[model samples]
Target: MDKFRVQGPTRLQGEVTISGAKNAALPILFAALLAEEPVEIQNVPKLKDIDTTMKLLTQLGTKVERXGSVWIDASNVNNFSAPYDLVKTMRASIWALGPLVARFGQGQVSLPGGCAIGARPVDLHIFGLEKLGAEIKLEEGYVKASVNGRLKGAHIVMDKVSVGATVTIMSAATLAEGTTIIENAAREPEIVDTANFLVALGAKISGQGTDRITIEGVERLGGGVYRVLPDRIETGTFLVAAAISGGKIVCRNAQPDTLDAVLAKLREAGADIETGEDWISLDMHGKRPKAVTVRTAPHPAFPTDMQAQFTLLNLVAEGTGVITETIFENRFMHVPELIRMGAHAEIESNTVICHGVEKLSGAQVMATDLRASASLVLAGCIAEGTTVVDRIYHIDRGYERIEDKLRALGANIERVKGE
Candidate 1:
C-alpha cells in the first residue's frame, strides 16, 4: 500500500534516461525460456511486473540471475503450468503459454487479469495458437494447451489486430513443423523487438513491424545475448511531464522513430520539441499550452496508452480539447478523478471532452489503472496544492522508479510507505 505525495506546481527541469520497455521485455523474458542454451538479456528495466515474471520463471525452474543484466537459463524448466497466483496480477503471464507449449509440448496457464481498461479477450490468442496446431482447452480458469508431436504451421488470419496474439503465436510458431504465415499482425515496436530477440536466438522470422509476418520453424534454438529496446511510453510520459509543468527536459536513451505520433501531438500543443538520434528535448518556455485534440489508435498512430496523459494536458491548455479512445472503452476512468481537482470534462461513449481551466486545485486521488496512474501524477505536477495518489502499486507495475525520476527533474514528489 504505497502512495505518492506531491507538493505540486513545480517546474520539472533536468535530464532523465528512459528504461527498457516493460511491454517488450515481458514477452521476451518468456520467449527466453524457449531457448535450450542460456540467454543473457541487457537493458532490462527493473519494475514490479518484471519481478513478477522473474518469480514466475523461477517457480517454473528457470534459473534467473541479475546483476547489471538478466541471465536466464530455462534449460531446466520442468513445470509447464503458470499458476493463478502469478498470472492473475500480470496479463503478460499469458505469454508463458506459448513458450511452454512450444518447448515442452504442453502448458497450463491461468487466465490473465491486469488493468481494468476494458475487455482484453484471449480469444484471438487461442485462435492463433489453434491455427498453429495447438489443441487448446479452457478449464477452471486456466488455458490448457498441448500439441501432438510437433505443431504443424498453418496460415493464420486474425479477425482483428492484437498485439498479444501476434507475439504469442509468433513465438510458438518458431518451433512448429513447417512455415507459418500470420496476417493482420500487430505492428508495435515491442513485437518487433521480441521478433528481433527471437532472431538472435536462431529463430527465422521476417516482416516484423508490419501487418503480416512469416516464421520458419526450426528444431532447436541456441541462446545468445539481446538488448531490450528503450521504452517509448516512458519517454512519452517524461515529455508530457515537461510540457504540463512548463519546463525544459531532455530524455536520453529514447528512440525518436517509435514516438512520431506522440511528438507530433506535443508540437501541436505549442511545446518547443527537438529530437536527435537517441534523445529528445522539450522546452515549454513558460507559455500556456494550446489545446490539441487527439484520437487513440494502434501503432504508427496516436497510442491508446498515451490517451490519459493527453487528456490531462488539455486541462491546463488555452482551449478545449477532445480525446477519443478507440482501443479501450473504460479508459476515461481518470476523468472523474480529474473532475475532483476542479477540471471539467464530459464523457460520451469512448470519447471525453475536456475544458481548459486556468488552474487546478489538487486533492486526494486513487489510481484506477496503469496509464491512469501516470495521468494523476502529471495532474499533480500542474495542480495548485498538494495531491496524494493512492494505489501506486499500479504505477510500480510498469514504471521504473517514477517518483525518483520525477524528483530528479525538480518535482516535489515523495513515496510514502504504508503498512
Candidate 2:
C-alpha cells in the first residue's frame, strides 16, 4: 500500500505539461490487438491502468515494448481468452473482447464485477456484439462469444449513452463485414480519437464527434502509429489544484475545445482563466472564490469525473455549491471522508450541497475510488496542517506521476510507502 503525505497551505505556481489521455489510450491499446502487424502508440501516459493493459496484452501472448509510449506486436497472438483474475479487477478489460472476437472469431472474457460506484452493466456491450452478428452467452461469470465466418454489421441504438459501449462496439465493428451505424454514440473526445486511430489503420470510420457514428467494415487492418490526445481530466484536475490552493498555474498540451464547459464554470466561480490554441492557465490570487452549482452530463458538458474535485473547491468557497452527479450514482462516497476532515456538506440523492468554510483542518482519510482519491488530495492541498490520504492505488490508475507533477508546481506533497 502507498499513501500521499501533504503539508498544506501551499500555493502552486509555474507550468506543468499534461500527459496523454488515459481514457483514450486504454481502448486504443486493445485496438492494437486487432491489427495484423506491429502498431506503435505515442504519447501514451504511464498510468497504472495503461500498465495493467500492457500486462493483459502480454499475458494474451501479444508482444509489447514500452519505449516512452507503447509498441505492440499483436500479430502473433492467437489466443482469445482473458482470465477472470485480470478482467474482474478493471472494467476496462472488457475492451479486449472486441479485438479478440474479431481476430480469432471466438472470445471468452471474464465479466467485470461491480466497483465502489453504481452497477455499470456490460449488457450494452453484450447487446452490441450480438447485433454485430456474434452469438454471445454468459456462463459461470464469463462471456463466451463466437462469430460465424466474419461478423456482419448492423444498426445499434444504445438505450443509454455509454462511453465504454461506444468504444467497444466501434473497435469490434472495424473488422466486421458490412457497415455498422451507432445511434446515440458517446461524444467524448476520447471516442473521436479512438475512431481516428482506427481510421488511420485502414478502418473506415466517421462521425465520431457526433451523437451518431458510422463504421464501414474493412477486410483487415494493418499496423499504424498514432499520438493520443491530451488528458482533459488531468487538465481539470490541475485547474482544481490551483483553485483549491489559491494558487496560479498553467497547464500545457490541453485542448481548449474539449474543456470549454469546465473552464467557463471555473470562470463563473471567480478563477482567472486564459486559453490558447492548445493550453489553458488559471490564476486564483486575491479572488474571493464563490461556490457554483455543477451538473455532470455527456461530452461538451461538465464531466462527472470532475464533480468530486469541484466539490472540494466548493468547500473553501464563499457560499453554497451544489453538485448533481447524473452519470454515477454512488460517486459521492468521499463526502463523508471530507466531512470528517472538518468540512460541512449535505447530500440529497445524487446531489451534494457544500457549505463553504474559511479553513479546513487536516485529518486521516481513505480514498474509495479514482476521482474521489483526487478530490481528497485537492482537499489536502489546502488544509491547515498535515493530511494523509490512503488507498492511493486508485489515484495511480488514471493520474501519471501526480506527486512529481504537484511537487514541481511548488506543492508540498510527497508519496510514501504505507503499511
Best by lDDT: 1
Residue pairs with colliding backbones in model 1 are: none
Which stretches of candidate 1 lie above 4 Å from their native place? Answer: 112-120
The lDDT, on a scale of 0 to 1, for candidate 1 is 0.89
Error of 1 at 218 (Å): 1.8
lDDT of 2 by residue, 1-419 (tens): 89999888677678889999988999999999888978899999987778778888998889998865899998678677888778866789889988888778988788754444334467788889999988897765788889987888999998888899999899999999999999999999999999999998999999999999999999999997899999999999998888776778899988988898899989988999999988899998956578999999888889988888898888889999999999888898889989987899999998999999988888889877888898888778788899999988888878888888988988788888988
TM-score of each: 0.94, 0.94
Worst 10 residues of 2 by lDDT: 112-121
- Candidates in order have lDDT scores of 0.89, 0.87
Candidate 2: C-alpha lDDT: 0.87
